[PDB]
Amino acid sequence: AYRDQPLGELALSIPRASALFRKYDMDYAAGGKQTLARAAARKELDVEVIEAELAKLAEQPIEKDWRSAPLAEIIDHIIVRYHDRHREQLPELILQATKVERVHADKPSVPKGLTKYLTMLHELLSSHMMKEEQILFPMIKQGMGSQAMGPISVMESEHDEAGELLEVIKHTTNNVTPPPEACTTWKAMYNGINELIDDLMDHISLENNVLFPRALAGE
Ligand SMILES: [Fe+3]
Ligand SMILES: [Fe+3]
């Protein structure tokens, strides 16, 4: 019956379900309202297998369940756990990609364009996180979340843009899989990319699937 539940709710209730969905390239973050059934069908996946994997994960509860946590605590968590980390992650990745694209320019597997797309993502996240921290999050903390349809819709649109950039970054890097000739810096950079993707999806998931709907509902 997991297939009839939304991707977002599964990711938020089952430990490491997020990483399972990442493995299947299912967008539980911006597309978290869609059922696992619909997502698995769009990708021609055996949904029974996925339900078995989720059942194994669900043997234990999620260590921290944010679905019912105070919105102020969710906001403060987002800022430290995700916003502050993205601010450090992206500059480092941009410099690594520049070095990789230069040093391995001749090699056929080099992820040409990676720096460009990381820079685009960094520019988007920088302004985006500033708008949330300076406009939307204070509004929610003040209790005006029920009036935030406009601002939230803008943020969710920017989340979609970030999702599109993540898709290009994954394609450019053969789904963040380095070639055999990959140097240490190359492999380390891909590990950092996967960490960024993991974090940004959980980050967007927490906003799209918990903070924003609960704020709009007046919680
Ligand atoms: Fe955010
Ligand atoms: Fe956001």
Residue range of the domain that includes 4: 1-219
> Which residues, at least 6 apart from 74, have a Cβ–Cβ distance to it below 8 Å?
66, 206, 210, 211
Structure tokens that stand for 82 in this block: 């995700």
At residue 35, φ and ψ (nearest 5 deg) are: -70, 155
Q: Which residue has the tokens 């869609």?
A: 34
Distance 123 CA to ligand 1 centre (A): 14
Residues 50-54: contacts with CB under 8 Å, at least 24 apart: 50/2, 50/3, 50/20, 50/24, 51/1, 51/2, 51/3, 53/20, 54/2, 54/10, 54/14, 54/17, 54/20
Distance 137 CA to ligand 1 centre (A): 9
Distance 210 CA to ligand 1 centre (A): 12
Distance 65 CA to ligand 2 centre (A): 19
Distance from C-alpha of 121 to C-alpha of 163, rounded to nearest angstrom: 9
> Which residues, at least 6 apart from 56, have a Cβ–Cβ distance to it below 8 Å?
none
148: amino acid identity, one letter = A
Measured CA angle at 192 (ends 186, 193), to 5 deg:
90
How many domains does the chain contain in total?
Answer: 1
Distance 153 CA to ligand 1 centre (A): 13
Q: Are 18 and 205 in contact (CB under 8 A)?
A: yes
Closest ligand (CA of 29): 2
Across 15-51, b (16+ Cβ under 10 Å) vs e yields ebbbebbbeeebbbbbbbebbbbebbeeeeeebeebb
Closest ligand (CA of 133): 1
47: amino acid identity, one letter = V
Breakpoints of the chain, after residues (C–N > 2.5 Å): none
Tell me how far CA of residue 199 lies from CA of 47, 58, 203, in angstroms.
25, 21, 6
Distance 86 CA to ligand 1 centre (A): 10
Distance 118 CA to ligand 2 centre (A): 17
Collapsed DSSP state (helix, strand, coil) of residue 35: strand
Task: Write down the H helix ranges in the chain.
Answer: 7-13, 17-23, 36-42, 47-57, 71-77, 84-103, 114-131, 137-141, 149-172, 184-206, 212-216
Residue 135 neighbours by CB distance under 10 Å:
13
